[PDB]
Amino acid sequence: XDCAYHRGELVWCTX
Amino acid sequence: DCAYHRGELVWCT
Amino acid sequence: GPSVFLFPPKPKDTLMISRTPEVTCVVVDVSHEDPEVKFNWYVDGVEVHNAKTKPREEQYNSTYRVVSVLTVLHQDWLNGKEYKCKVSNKALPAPIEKTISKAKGQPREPQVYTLPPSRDELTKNQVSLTCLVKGFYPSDIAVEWESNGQPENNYKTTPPVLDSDGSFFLYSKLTVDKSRWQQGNVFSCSVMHEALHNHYTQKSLSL
Amino acid sequence: GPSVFLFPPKPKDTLMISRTPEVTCVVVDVSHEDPEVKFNWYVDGVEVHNAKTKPREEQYNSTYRVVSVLTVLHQDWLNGKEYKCKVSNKALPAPIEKTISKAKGQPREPQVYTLPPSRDELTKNQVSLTCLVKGFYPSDIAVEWESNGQPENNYKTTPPVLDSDGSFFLYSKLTVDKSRWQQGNVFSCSVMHEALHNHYTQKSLSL
Numbered sequence: 001x002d003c004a005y006h007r008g009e010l011v012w013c014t015x
Numbered sequence: 016d017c018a019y020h021r022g023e024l025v026w027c028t
Numbered sequence: 029g030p031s032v033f034l035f036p037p038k039p040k041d042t043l044m045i046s047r048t049p050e051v052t053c054v055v056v057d058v059s060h061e062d063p064e065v066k067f068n069w070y071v072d073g074v075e076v077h078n079a080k081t082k083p084r085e086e087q088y089n090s091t092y093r094v095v096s097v098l099t100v101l102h103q104d105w106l107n108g109k110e111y112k113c114k115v116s117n118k119a120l121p122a123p124i125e126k127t128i129s130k131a132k133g134q135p136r137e138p139q140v141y142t143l144p145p146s147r148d149e150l151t152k153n154q155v156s157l158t159c160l161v162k163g164f165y166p167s168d169i170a171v172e173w174e175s176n177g178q179p180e181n182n183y184k185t186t187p188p189v190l191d192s193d194g195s196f197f198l199y200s201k202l203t204v205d206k207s208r209w210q211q212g213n214v215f216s217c218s219v220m221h222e223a224l225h226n227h228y229t230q231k232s233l234s235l
Numbered sequence: 236g237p238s239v240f241l242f243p244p245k246p247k248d249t250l251m252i253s254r255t256p257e258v259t260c261v262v263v264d265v266s267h268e269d270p271e272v273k274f275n276w277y278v279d280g281v282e283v284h285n286a287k288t289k290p291r292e293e294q295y296n297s298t299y300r301v302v303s304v305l306t307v308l309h310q311d312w313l314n315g316k317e318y319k320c321k322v323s324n325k326a327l328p329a330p331i332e333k334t335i336s337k338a339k340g341q342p343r344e345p346q347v348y349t350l351p352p353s354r355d356e357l358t359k360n361q362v363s364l365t366c367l368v369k370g371f372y373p374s375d376i377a378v379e380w381e382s383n384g385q386p387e388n389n390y391k392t393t394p395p396v397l398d399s400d401g402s403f404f405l406y407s408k409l410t411v412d413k414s415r416w417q418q419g420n421v422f423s424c425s426v427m428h429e430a431l432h433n434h435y436t437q438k439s440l441s442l
């Protein structure tokens with residue numbers, strides 16, 4: 001679902 | 016030839 | 029006597045769920061005739077008891093460096109929970125106490141703009157892809173480049189600067205071989221900040 | 236014992252012929268009870284006796300701040316002549332000596348680029364007019380903005396950042412009301428540096 005990633009690493013998900 | 020800035024002389028060559 | 033320095037965790041660590049953020053407490057100038065160091069910790073007054081202590085290390089200048097570390101909750105930190113580290117030492121008239129926190133102030137969202145390299149700079153072997161990140165608060169931020177999912181390390185970022193409207197701004201210069209740019213290869217400027225939807229945003233540029 | 240800080244002349248002062256650059260030698264922590272300070276100035280080991288002493292300032296923290304200023308020649312300072320201040324005082328065992336001079340290293344002329352505000356920025360009240368100044372050495376520089384004749388004061392300029400090719404670079408951000416920019420107003424970035432023709436240059440930037 002509604003997430004940010006950065007070079008494979010999960011950043012966050014507010015949703 | 017010369018250069019200036021807000022009036023005031025800067026420099027020449 | 030010995031002195032105490034209290035450091036925030038790393039932005040990337042507090043901004044990434046996948047990372048673990050920690051507050052460090054460093055005591056330098058610890059004496060041999062009393063290297064014993066007590067540590068007390070307080071999150072918002074409330075004491076806590078999970079602060080591991082890292083290898084004691086000799087500085088070779090006469091003194092010991094004693095360091096205690098405290099894992100924080102991404103959530104706790106971003107919300108603005110004052111951490112107190114309290115340091116006692118026999119060779120010391122009274123406990124020292126330092127406190128640190130999420131810079132006080134209304135988180136602002138950083139605007140991100142990829143500025144392209146100047147018409148008048150293509151006669152050089154390397155052009156400058158610019159990234160502007162204005163209007164953010166607090167100044168704690170991360171900023172990296174990349175292309176085709178691949179990182180671009182040949183860049184340099186200014187420090188953050190205080191603006192007219194009580195916010196910060198900064199510029200990051202990515203340097204690429206004219207050719208590559210001209211090719212059309214697309215470059216992306218990734219910005220990471222506490223005030224972004226999901227903390228992450230990625231403005232790119234090309235032609 | 237007292238302390239002594241040796242300061243370089245202001246860049247606009249070494250760079251503009253109309254202005255008179257001066258090396259400032261500063262001595263703090265001068266005691267309420269031996270405030271007599273002797274100065275010996277030298278230029279490359281050669282002594283010079285045309286220096287001036289600024290009036291004594293009492294700091295209200297129990298000490299005196301004693302300052303002696305020495306004019307330097309625009310041509311002597313750019314060429315790289317070393318300036319050495321020497322402070323003596325009964326409250327100071329051996330005299331103290333400090334030395335400054337134009338940063339050593341081949342001067343490299345800056346390329347100046349003006350980058351218009353990105354399309355995405357035209358939604359806000361004001362836009363951001365960027366000046367990139369890169370590839371210079373020394374870092375000592377001056378940069379301001381103006382618009383047809385008249386100077387634009389609303390801007391912030393980053394500290395010079397060490398680029399990877401050994402030179403420095405910086406960014407200046409001028410903020411102007413979107414309108415001004417929208418209706419063809421011309422904005423110029425003035426950069427003043429040692430290794431420029433006539434130590435000066437302006438760049439255009441309108442719509």
Ligand SMILES: *[C@@H]1O[C@H](CO[C@@H]2O[C@@H](C)[C@@H](O)[C@@H](O)[C@@H]2O)[C@@H](O[C@@H]2O[C@H](CO)[C@@H](O[C@@H]3O[C@H](CO[C@H]4O[C@H](CO)[C@@H](O)[C@H](O)[C@@H]4O[C@@H]4O[C@H](CO)[C@@H](O)[C@H](O)[C@H]4NC(C)=O)[C@@H](O)[C@H](O[C@H]4O[C@H](CO)[C@@H](O)[C@H](O)[C@@H]4O[C@@H]4O[C@H](CO)[C@@H](O)[C@H](O)[C@H]4NC(C)=O)[C@@H]3O)[C@H](O)[C@H]2NC(C)=O)[C@H](O)[C@H]1NC(C)=O
Nearest residue numbers: 031032033035036037038052054056057087089090091093
């Ligand atoms: C015996 O040795 C040790 C270490 O020796 C070191 O190495 C040898 C080989 C020599 O070359 C030495 O010259 C060298 O020091 C000595 O311990 C040093 O002690 C000094 C002071 O006594 C400490 O200085 C402090 O430094 C901090 C910042 O320190 C970081 O940056 C250093 C590089 O510049 C780096 O060495 C440190 O490791 C540390 O690194 C950071 O660490 C964090 C967490 O681990 C990490 O996440 C970061 O990424 C990392 N950053 C990097 C690597 O860049 C500085 O903050 C301190 O300044 C404040 O305090 C001053 C008072 O001393 C004050 O004057 C300043 O104004 C400033 O005050 C604060 O400002 C902020 C915001 O403005 C705010 O909180 C307050 O306003 C204010 N707070 C106050 C005043 O309390 C400080 O200068 C060194 O850290 C320390 N070195 C190491 C490696 O531990 C020891 O003294 C020696 N004993 C002797 C010679 O007798």
Ligand SMILES: *[C@@H]1O[C@H](CO[C@@H]2O[C@@H](C)[C@@H](O)[C@@H](O)[C@@H]2O)[C@@H](O[C@@H]2O[C@H](CO)[C@@H](O[C@@H]3O[C@H](CO[C@H]4O[C@H](CO)[C@@H](O)[C@H](O)[C@@H]4O[C@@H]4O[C@H](CO)[C@@H](O)[C@H](O)[C@H]4NC(C)=O)[C@@H](O)[C@H](O[C@H]4O[C@H](CO)[C@@H](O)[C@H](O)[C@@H]4O[C@@H]4O[C@H](CO)[C@@H](O)[C@H](O)[C@H]4NC(C)=O)[C@@H]3O)[C@H](O)[C@H]2NC(C)=O)[C@H](O)[C@H]1NC(C)=O
Nearest residue numbers: 238240242243244245259261263264294295296297298300
């Ligand atoms: C008693 O009071 C006096 C008077 O001070 C005043 O006291 C009360 C009343 C309040 O008014 C105070 O706030 C007020 O200052 C105290 O004197 C102070 O003593 C400290 C040190 O003990 C001095 O610090 C030095 O400051 C200079 C920079 O200072 C400029 O900026 C100051 C503010 O930013 C300003 O107040 C100064 O006047 C000074 O102004 C410059 O003056 C020249 C000519 O006059 C002018 O052309 C400039 O434009 C002007 N600049 C201005 C106005 O901004 C600073 O450079 C020194 O820093 C170095 O050394 C430290 C170690 O000593 C190191 O930690 C620093 O990082 C820095 O180190 C260097 O880094 C550079 C690169 O970054 C590197 O190249 C160097 O090699 C490196 N050198 C090192 C490491 O040694 C220094 O910190 C204050 O100037 C001085 N105050 C005044 C007014 O002079 C006095 O201490 C008190 N005594 C007590 C309390 O007991």
Ligand SMILES: [Cl-]
Nearest residue numbers: 237238239331
């Ligand atoms: Cl000194």
